[PDB]
Every structure is written in C-alpha cells, then in structure tokens.
Amino acid sequence: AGRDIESTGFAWWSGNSRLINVSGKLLGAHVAHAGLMVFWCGAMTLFEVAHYIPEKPLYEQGLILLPHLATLGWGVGPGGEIVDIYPYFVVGILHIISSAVLGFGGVYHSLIGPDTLEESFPAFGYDWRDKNKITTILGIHLVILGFGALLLVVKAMYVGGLYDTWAPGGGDVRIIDNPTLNPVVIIGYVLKSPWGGDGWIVSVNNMEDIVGGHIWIGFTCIAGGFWHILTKPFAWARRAYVWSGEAYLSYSLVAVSLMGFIASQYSWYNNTAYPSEFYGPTGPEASQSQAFTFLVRDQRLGASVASAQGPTGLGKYLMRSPSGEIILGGETQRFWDLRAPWIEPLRGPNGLDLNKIKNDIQPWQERRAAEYMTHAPLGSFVSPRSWLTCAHFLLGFVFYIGHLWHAGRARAAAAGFEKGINRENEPTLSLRPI
Amino acid sequence: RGWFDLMDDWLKRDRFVFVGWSGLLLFPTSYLSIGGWFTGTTFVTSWYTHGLASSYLEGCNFFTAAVSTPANSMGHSLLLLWGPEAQGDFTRWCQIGGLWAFCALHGSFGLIGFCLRQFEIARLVGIRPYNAIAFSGPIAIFVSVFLMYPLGQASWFFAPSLGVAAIFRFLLFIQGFHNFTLNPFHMMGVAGILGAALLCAIHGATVQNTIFEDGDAANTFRAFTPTQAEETYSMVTANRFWSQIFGVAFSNKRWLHFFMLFVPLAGLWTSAIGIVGLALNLRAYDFVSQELRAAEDPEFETFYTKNILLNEGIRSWMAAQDQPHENFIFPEEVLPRGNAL
Amino acid sequence: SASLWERFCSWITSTDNRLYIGWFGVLMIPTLLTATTVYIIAFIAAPPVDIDGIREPVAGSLLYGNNIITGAVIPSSASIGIHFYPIWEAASLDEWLYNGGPYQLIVDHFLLGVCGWIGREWEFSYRLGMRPWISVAFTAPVAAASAVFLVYPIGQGSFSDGMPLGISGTFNFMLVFQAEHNILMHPFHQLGVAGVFGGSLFSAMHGSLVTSSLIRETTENESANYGYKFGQEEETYNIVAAHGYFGRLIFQYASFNNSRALHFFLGLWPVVGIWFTALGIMTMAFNLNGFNFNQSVVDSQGRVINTWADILNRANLGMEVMHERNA
C-alpha cells in the first residue's frame, strides 16, 4: 500500500516521510504547498487592501505586503503617499487566481497522478543518488531564479522604476538608469563586516547598488544553472556530501535559515529596500528623529535650557563620536551609525553641521522627524518592522533546528544506524575502554 | 470479618480511581480547595482587602484573576466561617478574604492526603515509597511560602495570592523587600530546578539516541514492549559518549535515577529554608563591606549596588498600592529616581 | 595511514582519545579555552568598565572590591554599541579594557565554542554509531545563551544591554528586562517557566518511579546501586510495577507504558520550553513585549480599578525610573 506504518515504517505524524522515495506524489505535495503560498499572498493582499484607510500611513495599519508592493513603485507617488490601491488589488487577484491552478496541479500530481515518475516520464524521474540529474534540476531552478532576479531588474530599469527614499526632497518613483555593475562594490558588500557601523549586505543604502547587485545575482544564477546542467559534481564534492533527499532538504533548511536571519536584519535596519514611509522608521531612526526634533526645537525659540553655546561644547543634543565626528547627544549616541534621507543634507564631512541644521533645514525633514518620533519601534504601537523581524528571526532559528535534525538523520540513515544500535555488533564494544 | 476489615477491603478495590483510606482526607479537601479557588477567581472580589478587582465578574481574565489574601486588619486568624470575624455571614467572609484561608487550609490538608495516598499505593503495590518523599519537596514549598512566610510576617496579607499576576506581584514584592535573588538558599534552589530540567532533557535525549535497533520500522516507538527482560537502550554507548564528550558519565542506572530524583528535591528544600529565613526578615539583603565602600566612595559602583537601588525603587513605587492598609502617601520628591540620584 | 593528512584526520576523529576532539572540536577547543582564560583573568583583575558610556565606570572584578556573588565581566561600553571591538581596534590596551572589550571577546569565543560543542556532540554520536539528536536537545540552552548575549544586544543596538557575566549582573539583567519588557506577562517566558517546572517534576517523578521499583539484586549491608552492574543486559527495575503505581496514583489512562515514549517526552518537554523562552527573549529584543492588562477594569464613573497587573506595572515603573539615570 505504501500509506501505512506496516508497509513504510513511518507513523502518521511522520507520514510525509513516506514521500521520499515516490516522485510523483512528492512533486504534487510541493506544487500544492506552492499553491498554498500563492493563495496566502493573494488573500492577504486582498485583506490588506480591504482594510486600507487612505488617511493613515501604511505602517500604522499593520500592513506588510502593501509596503512590499509600494517599494516596487506601484501605486505610490512622491513622498511615499499612496495614490491608488488598484495595482495592489490586481496583484492579489493574480496570485489568488494562479493559486487555483497550482492547487489543482498539486492535487492531480498527488492523488491520481503516478506515484513514481521515472517509469512513465524518464525526463522527470530521479533516484536522489543520480548526481547528474539532481544537478540538472538544480541548474534549471537556478536559471528560473536568475530570470526572476532579472525580472526585478527589468522592473527597476524599464517598467516604471522603483521607489527611492534617497531622491531629493523625499522619496519618489525613479527609473534606475545606471546601476552599479562594478564588481568591487558588490564584492565589498558581500565581504563587509556584519557588526555595527558596517552592516555587511544590510547596509546597502542606494537603489543603484541594489539593481546592480541583482543584475550580478541574476546573471551569476543563469551561468551557474547552465554550469550545473552541463557538469557533474567533482571528486571533492562527491566525497564530502551525503547524496539523498533528506540531505538536500537539510542543505536547503540551513540556507533558508540564514536567509531568514538576513531578512530579519534587513527589515530591522535597512531603510532603503524597506522605506520608512511604508514600513515606518527603524528603532535607531526613531531615536535619532526624536533627538533631532528636540535639537530643532532648541535651535528655534531656545527656552529649553539651551539659548546659546554655553551648554556643553557644541549645541544642545550634540556630542562627538568615538572617532571624533559630531553626532546627536544623549541616549541615542549608540545610534550614530544611522543614515536617513531626512538627515543626510544636514550632515557634512565631520558629521552634523550645526549651522547647516540652522539654515539648510527643510520643512519636510522636520515633518518626517516628528512623524517618526511619534511612532518608535523601541519607544519614546507595534511596528511592522518589529513583526517582520521577530517572525523571520524565529523562522530562521526553527529552520536551523530543522536543518540540524534532518542533517543528523541523513547522516545516520546513510551510515545505517538511524533506527538504533544493532545490538549484535555494537560499535562501542569493539573499542577498547578509555 | 469486622466492619473495619470490610471498609478496608472496599477502599482498596481496583477501581478506575483508587480511593483508599487516604482518599477520605484527600478527595474532599482537594475538591473543596479547587472549587473555592474557582469560586474566588470567578465571583469573589478583593476590593475590601487589597483595593483590587480580582474576579471574572469584575472583568478580569485568567492572568489577572486571583483569590487574594485576607485583609491586613485580620492577623494570622484562621478566618473560620463561624469565626468572630465573619460570624457565619458568607458574604462578609468572602469580602474579608476568608476564601483564601479556606483554600489554603483545605489545600494543605489535600497535599497531606495526596502524600498519604502515595504512601498507601506504594505499600499496596509493594514498592519502595520514593514518591511521597519526592512530593515532600512541593509540600515544603507550599508550607514555607503560603503558610510559614505569612505566619512570620504581620498577617496572611503578605502571603501569595492564588493567581497568575498575583504570583508575579509576589515575586517582585519579595525581590524588592528582601533581595531574594541574593539569598544563597534561593540560589541553591535555582540551581536545583535548572539542573533537574537539564537532567530531564539530557536523560531523555540520551535514552532516545542510544536505543537498540529492536525493530525494522523507522519510527522506533513500536520496538518497545513493557514485558521486556532486556534494556531498550545501550548504557555502554551512552556512558562512552558522555565520558568522551563531557569528561564524566553515569555508569549506574540506579545512581542516575536517584540523582535525577535528588537534585530537584534538594533545590526545593534549600529554597524552602531560604523562604523560612525570609519569613522573619532574616534576609541576605546586603553586603556590609560593599555598602561601606559605596558610602565612602561615590565613584564605587557594582551591579549589586544597582540591584539595591532597583529594590528601593520597587519598595517606594509599589508600597502605596500594594499595602493600601498602611495609607502610604509618598510625594514625588521623596520617590527615588535614576535622574537626580 | 596513507598520507600525513590521513593520519591527522585519523587522530582528530579518533575514539581512543580521553576527550573526543573531532573537526568541530578543532574550532571548539581554542575558542572555549580562550574565552575561559580571558574570563578568569577579567574576573580576577579587570579594570572597571564604563558600561553606560558617561565616564562613570562600574567595577566587577575581585581585586576592585567584589566578591564571587557581586563579581562580573561588565558588558561593553554603550559608546561602542554593537561595533566589533577587538584588541587591535582600540588605541591602547587600557582603552580596550575601559570600554568592555573583554566582554565582547568572551561572548564571541563562547558562542563559537558552544556551536562547536553542538557540532561535536553530533560528531561523536556519528562516530559511535548512535542517533544524532542529543545536539538538537543542547540547542535550547545555546539558543538561550545567544539570545541573552548576542540577539538582545543586536535588537537593542548595544552590547551594554547584554547579560553581564556574573551573578549580581545576571540579577540586574533580569530586573531591567522585567522593567523594560514585562517578561513575566510574556507567554513565551510563561512557557519556559512551565518547561523548567515540568522538567523538575518529571525528573523527580521518573527518578522516584525507577528507584521505587528497583529489582532486589543486593543485600541490606550495601547500597542498592550495586544491584546494577555496568554493561548488564537485563533491566534493573520493573517497568510494570512503576506503571501500575503511576496508573493507580492518577486515573489508569494517564500513564506512559512505553519506556521509549516516556523518555522522548522527558527529552521533549524542557527543550521545547527553553526554545520558547529563548524565542520570547529574541522577540522582546525587537520590542515585541508581553501582555499589557493595565487599566483593564473601570467603574461606571470612569475611575480605574486596579488589578494585580496594575501592581506589577507599579513595580516595573519603580524599577524603570532607577535604571534610567537620565530624565
């Protein structure tokens, strides 16, 4: 039968483990889960556009997919304001309708489709041990991912453009004319330190770098896909990896765990790929905005125990960084690494210039600072950045756990003692004591 | 046979729920304690004892509903329903916190009855009574915390109230007024509890990962049957693993299980000793040398001094509402703050 | 045997060593030893650390007026934040000690060492031919340590918010965390408390049931532990007797007849609890705080009727003002 513990050795709560050695049902299960993901995307997009209040910003309504659609440039005008929600509705409808097709495909390939594929469709069958075929499938899906990255690039440069927070006078939908194709910048981003002040790949602060890096990622994925299609794993790779479905699953699990941690850090810190007009300010952004608002209200008027240069050495709410630059003083000193569009024109070679804040300040910068001070992820409302960061950090941790479990079990099953100790030739009985 | 023999035969009958002689004490006392706790958390208020709403009828949820301790005006009174405080009036008895005394007393007798039940079932089955000695840990915890501590204090008011948020309040109140984290007996209790959790997890994982391959199925729960004369997991493999991984390993199963028994029991008894010490305000609150050093050196600061300042903050900013009977009125100037310290 | 590298690999992965090394141990031993010696040296003789970054150092060393309880390795300076602060990135060794650099050194090497310990547990399980999921159990304390040492400083933006490497420092971390986030009302810390309490209860219960049903293999003049012989093939206690006692102490249905299932549950419960409490700490690092039931009861006129949550909030506020030395 193959659908019970008597014929498979797997209980019901481990029942999908019965899908390892049958290819058609495994393909159906994966297509059905993909349909579930697309259905959730479409349904949640429709839910968010159904609850969207025009006067409130996106980050004040508990929305997480509409900011993603707004970052791509759809339905957003200058300054991050949302013009119409119809393209978001179209996106939700398209996903929720393609979900029906994907769900039908999953149900067909799971229930009434052939259990195994190689006996009827040799071009799609596999054994989990034929390295050439698995590398071919990996290469095909690599080409698909590279084409998706190039599709994002085409959206960035040709079809409408992307929203940029670093455009003058607030963010705007801009066509990325000249992305950064220089390999030095991309490699430095990849090899950058992940600690404070550097941030590794999370610290990409302009759209040109994003588009150039996605160009490189797409072309590299296409090249690697063609490579893995046309090649076989080398001798060093063959002897190092376990070649089974569970081992590949564990590799994917650790990869997506690292990706989840990276995405949580991106949502928490990055304000370029995650604009603050859609996701709200970051915690450092909120703290620095509160400090900047207090500084502005001290420069104007001056009754808040700050009327001249007498307090401190510089003006109020100012101090020097550990490297000597001028930064905002107070408890926000730990957030001096923040770079935000509303504060960049006020920063010079030595840091924040007091006279430039006095004279070259703009009303929109003050409005942005005040509205970001009102909504603080750390405190001064649960930020959407907080939800994304917590959710994907938890997912990364639990998927690291899953990777450890599945990798250990893959090693045990390949070696041949995942069901227990043989009790006839016990390994520790042959080893000498001590 | 006699009437006593027939009653003993009936109480010892193999039913779905064993009754026994100890049941005559356990079942009514435990049932009344649980029912009184439900009644207090559902209907009875704390407005006349603590100045608080703790009931579902008043709008509280599971976390904030509690059977609050009696009013501080009552001393260490038994608060009998017929007692001079209530004089038979059920409403006044509930309003003065007598339901807390009802629950506490009938629950202590229920714990005694359950310990006797463990003794009786161990005697009838024919095994050693290492249960009801393990349960002496929880018994000591309950006696020290809910009985001995309020008896050493002014009244039943300072006992823990039977609720989630009430228990959290008790934790923070004891930390503020006693610095119980600094108490070495509490440290031994924390070590015992954490070590017991460690032992449970590590023993479960070690047994699950050293099982013999006694079945052809990938799921290995079916490979065990209770009528086995052979061990289901390899003790030698586990000993080798933990001796070459940690440097030391168990070689005797009996010693391992006695140790897993002993660690939480010892931790609970040490924590009970610490709470008994707290009952008379005989607390390891401060280090005299550190206080003297901080007094003569304003630039001397350690995390212990910061903890002392934090405990001062809990005491002053909670005294007014946590002890409404004292009528504490603290102006904002006298309230300690981090700014202007 | 075949080559020099093969001989090195055979020695590294040898089961004949007193302590197994393995490839994960190749990373674990240097990092753990470095963190251990630096921690000992700092606990004995480290200079005071300006943790708050406002030029008022805090002493945590024995030579500067601390005992064992009050001694700690002070977290890094708030001016450092979560910047990478090795010895070579400081102007002087005195500057490195003054800003809490040894805390970062110990934390990083200790996290690398515990990751290596997880991997080494898996590695020796594979070398001995046993099942590999002891490391999955050990992930939970590692997760908790990384949450209290690395994840929370990352979310807060400064290593000064990390847990100090001490006893009184740990208590201060707990009190400040409760004040800032109300961890007691967080359901994940409640799950962790349930996990540790259940772990203690289940360890005591399993020990009591095994010790109670020990098969008589010894005389009255010697310890009962000698009734069990290391390497014996028979079971030292009667599972049936313990199962009957447990099924008579409570109703018959509540019992673990299967020993393997019982031990799986014993492994599962505290590990899941510690996983949940570590996840709660990670979430509160990004300000996903616990439940807020403050001012949940009001009268007809609109006056707030306090609950126990209000008293808890009063205690949290009393801690908060003391922790914040600024306005």
């Binding site: - | - | 024995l62 064992i68 290391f230």
Partner: peptide, 30 residues
C-alpha cells in the same frame, strides 16, 4: 585578603573537576 580566599576556592574547584575527569574510576563490564 578575601580575594586570595576566593581565588583559592575557585582554583580548588577547577582542580577537583580536573581530577574527577582525568582520574575517575575507569568503567568496566562486570
């Protein structure tokens, strides 16, 4: 002077751990 006592106690505990690890009773099958 109490720092000397603290260090002595810590070093003694570490030495006890060392001797327990590397000078334990060697397990054998009986």
């Amino acid at each position: 002077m109490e720092t000397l006592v603290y260090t002595f106690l810590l070093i003694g505990t570490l030495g006890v751990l060392f001797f327990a690890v590397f000078f334990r009773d060697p397990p054998r099958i009986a």
